[PDB]
């Protein structure tokens, strides 16, 4: 719900970001401290969604 | 015996190392910038920013 924000904890995974950057299924697709196309060189843990 | 019989000789050596000191240390400030490391903002934005 709106405003019952479904929250995720995503860690110990390997995952491509380049199959949702050339994704045209998303009508926003902007970040603010990471470029979008550097995602799959560094890395961080413990990814919120 | 006497110690602290070469004053002067002592507060000029002190005096240098402590400006090397605190300029090696001023590597350590954001300056209003998101990192304080620079290869790190090499590998996280695009050139524009």
């Known amino acids: 719900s ?3 924000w ?3 904890r995503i860690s ?22 990471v ?7 560094l890395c961080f843990t413990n990814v919120y969604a | 015996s006497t110690a ?7 507060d000029v050596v002190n005096q240098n190392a402590q400006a090397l000191n605190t300029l090696v240390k001023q590597l350590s400030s ?4 998101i990192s304080s490391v620079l290869n790190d903002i090499l590998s996280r934005l695009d050139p524009p920013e």
């Open chain 1, 2 to 4: 709106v405003y019952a």
């Open chain 1, 6 to 8: 479904n929250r995720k």
């Open chain 1, 12 to 33: 110990n995974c390997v995952a491509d970001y380049s199959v949702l950057y050339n994704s045209a299924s998303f009508s926003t697709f902007k970040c603010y401290g």
């Open chain 1, 35 to 41: 470029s979008p196309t550097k995602l799959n060189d």
């Open chain 2, 4 to 10: 602290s019989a070469l004053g002067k000789l002592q």
């Open chain 2, 30 to 33: 954001n300056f209003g910038a």
